[PDB]
Amino acid sequence: CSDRKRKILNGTEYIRRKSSHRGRIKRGSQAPAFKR
């Protein structure tokens, strides 16, 4: 969470991680969504 939340805050995850939340710039999910 320290380095993990730091990556979230600086936005690496925003770019590199798929999101079932979608958005027009973020990567999307083409498979049914489930909590991981």
């Binding site: 498979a31 049914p32 969504a33 489930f34």
Partner: protein, 197 residues
């Protein structure tokens, strides 16, 4: 699926020929026939009908006349409450809190069944038989594999065939895309449920 849902809703809606609470012949004789009809279950509300059904199950499975806390009677009442909430959800599909209540009550019924299994095995079998619910056994601890695990949802599956099973739908098991009549391609998040054998 739709026909099974309609059958369940109709069966829940069926009103037997009886009165509410515990009125009997002498109690109802004093009143006039119109007021006795008002007392009858046909005029009664869904809560009163539900209470009448729970009372009948209790009288079936009770230790003595006022026994309502014995694990058998608790199992019967929890099953009745689960069925009533399932019907209510089928009607008010937008009532989210009742789904949470249903999950809580499923867990409670599971614990009651687990307790009764160890406490009295013959009575556990008899209660499951009378209630027409799956007689799950707790001889050894359950499994961490969902393909083998117990299903409190699947319990009382005789009433509802749509609460039995479902195909895997995650990652490699996700349903594949299909082109609809309108000409657009749609992917289902779940596999359409097939009637179980």
């Amino acid at each position: 699926y739709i026909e099974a849902e309609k059958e369940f809703l109709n069966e829940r809606a069926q009103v037997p020929d009886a009165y509410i609470e515990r009125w009997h012949g002498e109690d109802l004789s004093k009143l006039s026939p119109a007021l006795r009809r008002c007392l009858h279950l046909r005029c009664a509300s869904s809560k009163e009908l539900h209470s009448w059904r729970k009372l009948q199950l209790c009288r079936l499975l009770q230790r003595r006349p006022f026994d309502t806390g014995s694990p058998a009677v608790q199992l019967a009442c929890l099953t009745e409450k689960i069925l009533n909430v399932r019907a209510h959800l089928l009607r008010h599909f937008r009532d989210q809190q009742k789904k949470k209540v249903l999950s809580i009550w499923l867990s409670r019924r599971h614990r009651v069944m687990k307790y009764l299994y160890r406490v009295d095995f013959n009575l556990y079998k008899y209660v499951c038989q009378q209630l027409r619910i799956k007689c799950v056994r707790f001889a050894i601890p359950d499994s961490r594999d969902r393909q083998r695990a117990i299903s409190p949802i699947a319990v009382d599956g005789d009433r509802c065939k749509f609460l039995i099973r479902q195909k895997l739908w995650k990652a490699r098991f996700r349903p594949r895309q299909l082109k609809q009549v309108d000409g657009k391609v749609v992917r289902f998040t779940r596999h359409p449920m097939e009637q179980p054998s």
